[PDB]
């Protein structure tokens, strides 16, 4: 008599990426601050 | 002279707003890519887990049947 | 003697939606390109 | 004449910026909806998996107890 | 003879946060509507 | 007089666009934080599930070996 080995499906390869948009947020805030230098003072 | 000042300030503001719009588009694209990748990851996880739980279910019913035969 | 059947909870219904904002990204890039046609040339 | 040109260019730019802001708002709304749906999906998955692992734990302890009684 | 108790790792602590940016979307739409009050009418 | 009107409308529009850019930056920051938190949650879930499935595999092979010894 014998018994087989139960091999379960591997899920370690499933990975979730991370987003890095801090450059774009910093640029948006920088432009929002720099638009004060574009105000018209007649 | 005031017209040239108005035009220069307007052109500067339009350039900065173009930069801001390009940054917003790039950020939205990166967010879309990452959200879709995590969605595919979760779906793959659910599929693989369904397979694994089916396998565990089959093995457990087999073990229960063996125990029933023994006892 | 008998043994019951172990029914495990089904999780196949769990689904993750996908986002489709390519129209909005394309519109943003199109406006960023078209704002050159709004520059003042006195 | 230059004033009319400035006004026309400014109105065109403001219209385009309004379009861009509407597009950004729509994109952010869609991203919020999808991120929240995937969050609810992950939470439902964790809850269902907790239930399933509790069931597997109970069944496995029962099988171990049966084996202990047999041997 | 004895048999140990199989304690499986707890995963109940894993939680996914939710985002609330409805204030920002509402502000963006409000500004897109209010920019009509900034149009130049010579 | 028309120059003052142009300047006032331009300054108002630039202020509103600054508000819109700040709102977009805040929204993108919140979306980034939540997407990254859900990504870490999914990764932690995959790691813990790998551990749990390894444990279940070991226990099931042990139970199968015990049954083989019995029968």
Give chain E's domain count: 1
- Cα separation, F7 vs B50, whole angstroms: 64
Q: Which of B24, B28, B41 sits opposite F42 (nearest CB)?
A: B41
Q: Which residues of D touch E38 (CB under 8 A)?
A: 14
**Domain span at residue E39?**
1-42
Kindly report the number of other CB atoms within 10 A of residue D54's CB atom.
Answer: 14
Tell me the shortest Cα–Cα distance from D60 to chain C, in angstroms. Answer: 11
**H helix intervals, chain F:** 2-70
- Cα separation, D63 vs A3, whole angstroms: 17
Rounded to 5 degrees, φ, ψ at E28 are -60, -45
Instruction: Please check whether residue D38 is in contact with residue C17, taking contact to mean a CB–CB distance below 8 angstroms.
Output: yes
Burial of F1 (0-12, 13-18, 19+ CB in 10 A): exposed
Classified as helix, coil or strand, A21 is: coil
Documented resolution in Å:
2.2
Kindly report the number of other CB atoms within 10 A of residue F53's CB atom.
Answer: 24
- Cα separation, B30 vs B33, whole angstroms: 5
Is A34 part of the contact surface with chain F (CB cutoff 8 Å)?
A: no
- Cα separation, D43 vs B54, whole angstroms: 21
Cα of D69 vs its chain's centroid, Å:
49
Kindly report the number of other CB atoms within 10 A of residue A39's CB atom.
Answer: 14
Nearest CA in chain C to D44: C14
E21: left (phi over 0), alpha (psi -120 to 50) or beta: alpha
| A–F touching, 3+ CB–CB pairs within 8 Å | yes
Instruction: Please check whether residue E3 is in contact with residue F63, taking contact to mean a CB–CB distance below 8 angstroms.
Output: no
Structure tokens at F6: 């142009």
**H helix intervals, chain B:** 2-70
Those residues with Cβ within 8 angstroms of residue F19's Cβ, 6 or more apart along the chain or in another chain? E27, E31
- Cα separation, F24 vs F8, whole angstroms: 24
Tell me the shortest Cα–Cα distance from A33 to chain B, in angstroms. Answer: 10
Structure tokens at C37: 């046609």
Nearest CA in chain F to B43: F42
Q: Which residues of F touch D38 (CB under 8 A)?
A: 38
- Cα separation, B23 vs D2, whole angstroms: 32
């Amino acid at each position: 008599h014998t018994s087989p080995d139960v091999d379960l499906g591997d899920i370690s390869g499933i990975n979730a990426s991370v987003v890095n948009i801090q450059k774009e947020i910093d640029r948006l805030n920088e432009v929002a601050k720099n638009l004060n230098e574009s105000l018209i003072d007649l | 002279e005031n017209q040239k000042l108005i035009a220069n300030q307007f052109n500067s503001a339009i350039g900065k707003i173009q930069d801001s719009l390009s940054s917003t588009a790039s950020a939205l694209g990166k967010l879309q890519d990452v959200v879709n990748q995590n969605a595919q990851a979760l779906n793959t996880l659910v599929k693989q887990l369904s397979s694994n739980f089916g396998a565990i279910s089959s093995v457990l019913n087999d073990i229960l049947s063996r125990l029933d035969k023994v006892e």
